[PDB]
DNA sequence: ATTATGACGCT
DNA sequence: AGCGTCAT
Ligand SMILES: Nc1nc2c(ncn2[C@H]2C[C@H](O)[C@@H](COP(=O)(O)NP(=O)(O)OP(=O)(O)O)O2)c(=O)[nH]1
Ligand SMILES: [Mg+2]
């Protein structure tokens with residue numbers, strides 16, 4: 001009743017760039033704009049692997065993880081941009097720099113948590129409080145929310161998408177009690193106004209479009225963001241959660257798309273997030289552990305406490321390359337040359353990171369996969385990272401992995417290596 | 431022969 | 442510390 005916390009204390013937004021790498025390539029090459037197009041890495045094997053897809057190309061069924069040759073079967077006029085190759089490997093520097101452009105604009109409005117190359121969480125609670133003081137009890141015009149959807153509306157007592165969007169927004173705004181500056185729905189609405197401004201600033205200053213979700217926590221903001229991509233933002237209120245979750249497959253919630261979500265489904269015999277409400281917190285903890293159980297008990301009621309971390313920069317800087325099937329490394333000189341290529345890219349990125357961000361990595365993590373191991377990493381070893389020198393880190397990485405070589409022969413490497421991965425971690429201010 | 435990362439939990 | 446999970 002009056003003591004049951006409802007998880008409405010914060011206003012959190014999630015901003016995700018639409019088909020990000022495609023937009024980066026379309027900005028650079030206007031010939032790609034407003035076309036079915038995709039970004040690929042490599043080319044020789046099946047045309048390259050697609051990692052990003054414009055919405056025009058998605059209409060033909062083109063997806064991430066497709067081979068370009070197969071995508072061209074679905075969409076013969078598909079345009080393709082390839083990721084840069086440097087030192088024999090894909091080099092994603094252009095997209096990391098574009099990401100910094102967007103993150104620096106977002107940081108003007110609030111402290112952000114960089115959650116990936118193309119998305120950031122924003123804690124707008126304080127900014128909403130400020131804007132509410134400025135508004136002085138003045139209602140919010142629909143003109144301030146020109147690209148906002150209100151999830152669950154319109155309801156009750158009408159054919160095009162924009163018309164539907166505007167009907168829902170009108171219902172929401174008419175139901176608002178703009179007197180109470182502590183009303184969570186009002187706070188969400190003001191948060192959406194601010195996110196409209198942030199998205200306008202990103203597009204004006206970078207050319208990139210994005211979508212966003214606004215809700216009371218990170219998981220609902222992320223879910224909301226997905227509901228109306230591209231180039232739109234969605235407000236998911238606390239009140240919208242029961243209907244939203246009543247048909248929402250468990251796997252759609254971030255962190256439940258893998259084995260844990262499958263076990264929720266199988267152990268409990270349920271399909272949708274809303275069905276979780278019928279179990280006690282202790283029941284969920286008994287099946288899925290204390291932390292997972294408490295998190296599920298709260299999440300299915302729309303409640304989640306994970307804070308928006310003040311972290312604009314990635315925590316690690318890493319370099320990896322697969323060597324599939326027959327290109328796997330089977331000689332000591334091969335392993336050395338590729339460790340050096342990866343180490344040279346890492347040294348470049350680390351040096352730029354130190355200059356930009358006033359920090360130094362102190363630990364080097366070396367991960368490999370061996371032929372016939374279905375795991376991501378077959379072996380992980382750390383060593384000290386004391387200087388930004390590629391020859392040094394590649395020799396150290398070799399020193400920490402060389403005992404994996406089964407070959408009694410010193411020239412060969414067996415079993416051959418199907419993946420090398422160098423990761424700089426444990427940053428300290430410098 | 432999806433690939434290249436990044437975050438984070440577990441023990 | 443090293444491994445597993447999840448994301449995409
Ligand atoms: N190297 C690599 N990059 C990837 C991979 N998957 C995604 N990316 C890169 C390419 C993506 O552009 C970028 C952001 O990932 P999203 O936000 O999940 N997809 P997007 O922004 O394209 O479309 P949406 O409008 O649905 O948000 O990450 C991958 O497996 N490997
Ligand atoms: Mg995106």
Ligand SMILES: [Mg+2]
Nearest residue numbers: 016116118119
């Ligand atoms: Mg994203």
